[PDB]
Every structure is written in C-alpha cells, then in structure tokens.
Write a protein that binds this ligand. Structure first.
Ligand SMILES: Cc1cn([C@H]2C[C@H](OP(=O)(O)O)[C@@H](COP(=O)(O)O)O2)c(=O)[nH]c1=O
Ligand SMILES: [Ca+2]
Length: 129
C-alpha cells in the first residue's frame, strides 16, 4: 500500500472525517473499525479522540487498500495517518473502536488492528471496561 496526501477539512465523528483529497472534498470512513455513534456510550470520546488526532496533525495522509475505494454512500475507504500514526489503529488500541467491517480484499491491516484490540481488551480500556 501507499500513503497519499490529504488535508483536513473537518472532524466529523470517531470513524469519519472530511478531508481534501486530490483537491476534492470527500468524507472518509476509516477501514476495519467501528466507533460508537456520538449518541452512544464512548461515542463522544471516540469523536474527541479522532478530532484531536486529525486537527493536531501537521501531515494528514490516506492509504487505500487493494479493494473498493469508496463505499455505497460515496465515502472514501482508507487508513488514515496523522503525523505517521494510523488513526484506525490508535482508536482500536485505546478501546474507542472495535475491529469491524472486515471485507475480503480490503483487509491489509486486519491483524495489526486485532493485535491492538487484544491489548486494549487486556487493559480493560474504555469499551472493554
Ligand atoms: C467500514 C465500511 C462500512 N461500509 C458500509 C457497511 C455499513 O452499511 P449500512 O449503512 O447498511 O449498515 C455501513 C457502516 O458504516 P457506519 O459504521 O459509518 O454506519 O457502511 C462498507 O461498505 N465498507 C466498509 O469498509
Ligand atoms: Ca460507526
């Protein structure tokens, strides 16, 4: 896979963000994770966590996987990086998202994220508390 540039337009929630990519505004849905909706338990904390990670970053990147690059809603499907740290993994490692939505062909970072989830679960963090 390859990191590509993007710039933040706006935080949305724990697993969606509005970024400018190839010069066009797009909503991105983070691959392989599910954060609680804002109205759910830990939804606010997941939103805040992503918000802070993307707003503080000097360099935002997106990395598409091998399969579908946009979902049925027109959302881009990517791994997002903030100053070289993957937001998808960071959310899981902190117990603020579950590994989820693992479709064949867009699952390159599956095992990295499951390893993170195991550790968040061991530590009883957030969702796992
Ligand atoms: C993460 C992801 C979600 N989606 C679709 C599946 C779900 O369909 P439904 O809307 O029919 O439930 C929805 C979940 O996204 P959200 O968790 O943002 O709601 O997005 C994909 O198609 N591919 C993906 O890789
Ligand atoms: Ca969600």
């Amino acid at each position: 896979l390859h990191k590509e540039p993007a710039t933040l337009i706006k935080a949305i929630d724990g697993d969606t963000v509005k970024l400018m990519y190839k010069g066009q505004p797009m909503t991105f849905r983070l691959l392989l994770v599910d954060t609680p909706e804002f109205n759910e338990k830990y939804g606010p904390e997941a939103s805040a966590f992503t918000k802070k990670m993307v707003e503080n970053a000097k360099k935002i990147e997106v990395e598409f996987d091998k399969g579908q690059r946009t979902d049925k809603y027109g959302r881009g499907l990517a791994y997002n990086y903030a100053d070289g740290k993957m937001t998808n993994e960071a959310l899981v490692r902190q117990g603020l998202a579950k590994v989820a939505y693992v479709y064949k062909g867009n699952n390159t970072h599956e095992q990295l994220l499951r390893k993170a989830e195991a550790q968040a679960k061991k530590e009883k963090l957030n969702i796992w508390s």
